[PDB]
Amino acid sequence: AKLALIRLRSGIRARGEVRDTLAMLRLHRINHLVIVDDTPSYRGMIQKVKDYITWGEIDKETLAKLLRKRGRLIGNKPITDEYVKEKLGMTIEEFAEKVVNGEMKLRDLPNIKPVFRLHPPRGGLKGSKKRSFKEGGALGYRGEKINELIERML
Amino acid sequence: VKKAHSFRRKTRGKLSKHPRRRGLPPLTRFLQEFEVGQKVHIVIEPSYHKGMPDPRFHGRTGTVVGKRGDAYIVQITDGGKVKTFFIHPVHLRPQK
RNA sequence: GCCCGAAAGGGUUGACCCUCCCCGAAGGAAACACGGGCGACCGUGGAGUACGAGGGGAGGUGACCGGGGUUGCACCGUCCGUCUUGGAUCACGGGGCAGGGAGUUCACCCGAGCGGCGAGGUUAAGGGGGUCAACCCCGAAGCCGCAGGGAAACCGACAGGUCC
RNA sequence: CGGAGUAGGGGGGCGGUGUAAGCCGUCACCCGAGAGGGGAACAACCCAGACCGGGGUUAAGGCCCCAAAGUGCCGGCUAAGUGUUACUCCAAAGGGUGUCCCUGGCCUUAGACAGCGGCCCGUCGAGGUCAGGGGCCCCGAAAAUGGACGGGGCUUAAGCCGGCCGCCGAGACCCCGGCGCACGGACCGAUUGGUCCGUGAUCGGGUAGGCGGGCGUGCCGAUGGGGCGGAAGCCGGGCCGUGAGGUCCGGUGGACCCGUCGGUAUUGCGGAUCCUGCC
RNA sequence: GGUGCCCUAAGGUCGGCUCAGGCGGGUCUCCGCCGUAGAGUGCAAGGGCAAAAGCCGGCCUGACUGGACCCGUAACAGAGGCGGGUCCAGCCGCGAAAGCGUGGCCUAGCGAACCCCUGUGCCUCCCCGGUGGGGGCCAGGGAUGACAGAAAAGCUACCCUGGGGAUAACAGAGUCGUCUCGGGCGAGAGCCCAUAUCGACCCCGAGGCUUGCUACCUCGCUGUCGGCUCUUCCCAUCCUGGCCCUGCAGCAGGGGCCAAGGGUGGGGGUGUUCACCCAUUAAAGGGGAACGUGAGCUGGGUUUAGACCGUCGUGAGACAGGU
RNA sequence: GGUACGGCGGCCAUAGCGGCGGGGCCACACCCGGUCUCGUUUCGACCCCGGAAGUUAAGCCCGCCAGCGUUCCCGGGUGUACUGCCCUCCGAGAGGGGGCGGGAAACCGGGAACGCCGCCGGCCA
């Protein structure tokens, strides 16, 4: 399954290995989102930076909306139904249905950027940046409930 | 009070032998064979005091590059420097 | 708010202000109508509407605008240089103005940015000529380089054989 | 291959020693060499890393007045102004039918107090009694100029416990325009280069220090110009310029001055308990 | 806790054999048995070691010569001198052979330049060639313990300079072992009676008025003790007001609660603060304010320059000893 | 093809200590003696030399046993103790707590376990 990861906290006051892990994962700034494949190698890194991000499983509909609004190409040009219907023989909903299940990867679309830069959340984060999401805060594994947050940040 | 390094400094457990070995090792080790490019572990047998390198490098892994006498030449990486040792094969062990 | 405002800045080929329309990023209501919750409130619709930085255009009014001096109101703000882990310091230097005031020159050595000749390169002291401290021609003595090893005696090498 | 600077470190976490303060190390996150938003104010505790002009949403945390936004909703506790303190900066052993709760035994249609008399009847007839565990508060609890929850003040709170719902709030994040930088490309140049195009979520803080380009001052060799129809200098002003600074207007003044190219230098001051002169 | 050495064997090899301790016999070294090492190893500690690396013997002198490379001191990451290790060649030892042997089972027992001594065999000394004597290459040795290496005693109170709060005495900050003031529990004492009074041994604290520890501020700000003068504050209350318990008859005493409005003085010796003493008194409390107060006084003490005594010192001289 | 035989080995206690029942043409042992090969600070007791009169009692070989020691598995102890990262969590403080990840030792009960694997023979047919 595909995983969505959002960064929330800063690296000042953080160890030197967490910053390097985050750079590898392409999470350089706050309110920045990355999509990733569920594998042990990636689970290790998420376990290391569990205290500066949130993550979960993403959905077809949410990835379609994400692509339409916050998806950019090289040059920070938007993504369009024509661009996709041309470079690939399908539209954006189908593209996303595939990505979230296999049969295709995001990089199969040329000049796509692997980073979605989001807007801060409306109504704000409704919890503490200092606790986990299960004990009443903002961080850690949230499952199918990362989609609500993405839609708020979109 | 400072204290220089020397061969047998802080070797009370590293160069101690389990109470159930206590003697000669089996003879499938003095007559080990190795090839070039073969990776080896540096593991010291405390009963044999010939060809024993500095315990500083106990537990490290190197590559064989040659042979001189009954000894083998071994290269290890220490930071960014290369270090070359002449070791008897009872102190060595093949990978996998 | 009061005061100056000629020129060098804009402006009667129209200043300031006024209203009208079109496009409109990120974002983004309310009244009101139905229902959920003990409740603060929320959901669907209204509605991505009304609005929105800015970009364009159409008109009315007819002389200031920008700039400067001082001052009122609200918010913000413990000077300057210096060593020191650490300066608003009860640590040192600090009454005001104007002028002066601190990485230079030689000789050897290591390197570079350019330029000339090139298995050779380069002249010194000096000499001759001239329109006479500028200019022109001669002058290789010597120094570096082309063969190194060795305390010394002494001996004395690949102008290309193979591979990546 | 060349040019440095550094040989007093400190907050915070871990270890040895020490009554402790502190001493000696270690870790490499921060101050030093780091702005901005909050903690009343605070070097290193929280959010967060900063070209310029503007628009909007958030973080830390906050929402009775000071002070932007709730005299917010539900359930319960405290009567001591306890408290109104994340940390920086805050008292114990020992005790309490103060109150609110959990648990387990023994009693009960006559129990546990009273009263009337010799273990008892009736008598007023309904809930008692013993232990153990927890929450909040109380005693224990005494200082020196005049007072500190930041202050006013607050008692079904404007306090504490358990949960919830909406707003306010940074230079953070999103958007719009402009500047520069690094990399690559084209064209173009009498010489260190210039004009444009692409990319930049992965460029834009800086002490010691290293590198690049420019402003200004005096003299030379050349080139091109101005001046008694008023040069330099001085005063007050306008415009360009990130800036070092340049240039014009008016006045005063009464003879010299600037630009471009290349060279050269007693070449730029707020400080030295600096020197001279004046006040 | 140890080394600044010892060893011709305690060094090389070959062969044979097993230890300390105890049990059971025999008397005051003999037989058997159990015995993973509880012994020994040239010397500390740690590690290693049983047909042995221990003990008993036999033969030898690899404790040698000429030379390479690598590890440590000194991690990562620079190195002179020293030390160790793996090898090539030569000559040899032990052993039937394979094999081992470049000192001591491993880790301590030592040292640059210049100069000198010894050994060995060759090169050289100013036109040439001889003799005597000089210089050089190679190897070994003589020492610097402050041991990566100067040839080397003290006073300053007549003192000077340059600097330091990187560093003391003095007041501040921090801390509170010590200090002052308290508490819990109940052993025991009080004719009997745990609590009138005393309260051990053990446990828990406040304050910052003693003293220490540290070294954060200040090295030309001022450096100070006591006294006189003058103002103010705390309460942990000495008297003065009001109360409670008593092993409170009264007069009184002891112990405790509220209370800080007022008062708490004069003199003797001593530089004194405190402490001691006298006579009175309602009683003659303890502390803070930069150990309050020198741009307010004084100037007895203490820390300059003069001099005396005692001790110490060869002496110059010193004494937190006196005058 | 057969063996109640043997030599050289590897893993080096799941193999070890102790205890028991059985077996012996060929082979290993215990045995008789030793002059010479060899030697016992003194003895063919030890070691070396030549044979077998005797037997399986010992060593060797086959089989078993869980008294001691070792090793592995199943449940508990127990997700206990300790621990890496984060926290505007508690507490006067000492020290504790929550979330995400790893995770024992003793002890208890129950099993298995009294060795596995190579190369070469010799003899019976």
Curated annotation (Swiss-Prot), chain A:
Any one GO BP annotation for this protein: maturation of LSU-rRNA from tricistronic rRNA transcript (SSU-rRNA, 5.8S rRNA, LSU-rRNA)
Record InterPro entries: Ribo_uL30_ferredoxin-like_sf (IPR036919), Ribosomal_uL30 (IPR039699), Ribosomal_uL30_arc (IPR005997), Ribosomal_uL30_CS (IPR018038), Ribosomal_uL30_euk_arc (IPR035808), Ribosomal_uL30_ferredoxin-like (IPR016082)
GO molecular function: RNA binding; structural constituent of ribosome
Gene Ontology cellular component terms for the protein in this record: cytosolic large ribosomal subunit
Classification via Pfam families: Ribosomal_L30
Keyword tags: Ribonucleoprotein, Ribosomal protein
Source domain of life: Archaea
Quaternary context: Part of the 50S ribosomal subunit.
UniProt cross-references to NCBIfam families, sorted A to Z: PRK06049.1 (NF004711), uL30_arch (TIGR01309)
Family statement drawn from the similarity comment of this UniProt entry: Belongs to the universal ribosomal protein uL30 family.
Record-given protein name: Large ribosomal subunit protein uL30
Curated annotation (Swiss-Prot), chain B:
PROSITE patterns: RIBOSOMAL_L21E
Any single GO BP term: translation
UniProt xrefs under Pfam families: Ribosomal_L21e (PF01157)
Any GO CC annotation of this UniProt entry: cytosolic large ribosomal subunit
Disordered, as annotated region: 1-26
NCBIfam families documented for this protein: PRK04306.1
Name of the protein this chain belongs to: Large ribosomal subunit protein eL21
Gene name of the encoded protein: rpl21e
